[PDB]
Amino acid sequence: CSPGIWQLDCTHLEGKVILVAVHVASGYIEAEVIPAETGQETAYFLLKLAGRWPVKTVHTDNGSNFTSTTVKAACWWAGIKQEESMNKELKKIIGQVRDQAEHLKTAVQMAVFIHNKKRKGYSAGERIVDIIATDI
Amino acid sequence: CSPGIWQLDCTHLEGKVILVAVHVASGYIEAEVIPAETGQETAYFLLKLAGRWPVKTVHTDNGSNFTSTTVKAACWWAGIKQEESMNKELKKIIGQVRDQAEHLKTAVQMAVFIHNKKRKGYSAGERIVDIIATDI
Ligand SMILES: Cn1c([C@H](OC(C)(C)C)C(=O)O)c(-c2ccc3c(c2)CCCO3)c2ccccc21
Numbered sequence: 427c428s429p430g431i432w433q434l435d436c437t438h439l440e441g442k443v444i445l446v447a448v449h450v451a452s453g454y455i456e457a458e459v460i461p462a463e464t465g466q467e468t469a470y471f472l473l474k475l476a477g478r479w480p481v482k483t484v485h486t487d488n489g490s491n492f493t494s495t496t497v498k499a500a501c502w503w504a505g506i507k508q509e510e511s512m513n514k515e516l517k518k519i520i521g522q523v524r525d526q527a528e529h530l531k532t533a534v535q536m537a538v539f540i541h542n543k544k545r546k547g548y549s550a551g552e553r554i555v556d557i558i559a560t561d562i
Numbered sequence: 563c564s565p566g567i568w569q570l571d572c573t574h575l576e577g578k579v580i581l582v583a584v585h586v587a588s589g590y591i592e593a594e595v596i597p598a599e600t601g602q603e604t605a606y607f608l609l610k611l612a613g614r615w616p617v618k619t620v621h622t623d624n625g626s627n628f629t630s631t632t633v634k635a636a637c638w639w640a641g642i643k644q645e646e647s648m649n650k651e652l653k654k655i656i657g658q659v660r661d662q663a664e665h666l667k668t669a670v671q672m673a674v675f676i677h678n679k680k681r682k683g684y685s686a687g688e689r690i691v692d693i694i695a696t697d698i
């Protein structure tokens with residue numbers, strides 16, 4: 427599909443919030459552990475994401491995630507418009523690696539690493555880079 | 563140069579710590595505002611970075627940044643080996659945009675966005691994506 431389409435959602439583990447972004451065209455994932463499931467966190471995350479990738483449109487499974495003024499401000503400034511089982515796979519790898527790390531965020535980043543590097547025969551990271559490069 | 567070489571340093575503003583990573587071959591920047599200039603923050607940042615890009619070697623202007631056990635553990639797990647004026651340009655853009663945002667971290671991410679999108683005639687983001695894709 428379009429190379430600038432992303433998907434953004436939050437999942438929960440150990441009473442903590444995990445913000446997950448998926449480059450739909452590729453399956454590449456970015457994730458962060460946030461204290462509160464607030465629009466301020468979502469907006470800051472969006473700013474980080476747009477400065478790194480060409481983000482055209484963002485989809486979500488909880489539309490109310492994108493109603494706060496802070497979120498709309500972030501999408502406005504970065505020129506972003508609104509528009510899986512990835513949470514389940516990521517939760518799988520997280521469960522697999524959880525005991526190697528004290529904090530949940532470390533295991534989250536470990537799982538992101540594994541998922542993006544996994545070969546399927548390019549990997550998710552290779553796929554996102556190649557799609558965005560080709561589009562150039 | 564080699565597409566897997568990164569540069570990592572911390573700068574200071576408003577009594578806060580900004581961790582800055584530069585993809586040397588391209589000039590692409592990632593940055594985060596951290597509470598303390600500790601090895602734990604550096605290690606977590608490195609885990610995030612390696613899961614997103616093919617990180618082979620990391621250089622720094624403060625070698626003692628990479629002596630903590632936590633840092634070496636992160637480089638071990640991700641398979642990372644040790645080995646500008648970007649801080650000044652980034653500080654420039656940050657100064658330019660600082661009044662549009664309440665928090666420093668928002669202005670930092672704004673500056674990262676501007677720098678990575680700036681045209682020079684591809685941009686830094688386009689360059690990193692194209693280098694890493696070509697290397698594929
Ligand atoms: C607290 N802590 C952690 C780690 O937490 C941070 C990443 C935030 C530092 C955590 O939650 O277990 C590490 C550590 C660093 C790297 C690393 C791993 C664990 C596991 C996967 C591979 O990479 C570590 C090492 C020596 C002392 C203390 C440590």
Ligand SMILES: Cn1c([C@H](OC(C)(C)C)C(=O)O)c(-c2ccc3c(c2)CCCO3)c2ccccc21
Binds near residue numbers: 473499500665672
């Ligand atoms: C506190 N706050 C912020 C912003 O802080 C966060 C990003 C952490 C939310 C800050 O430091 O000024 C924003 C805001 C959101 C997006 C955005 C900008 C500012 C400026 C550049 C373009 O993008 C915002 C909006 C409505 C109410 C409160 C706000």
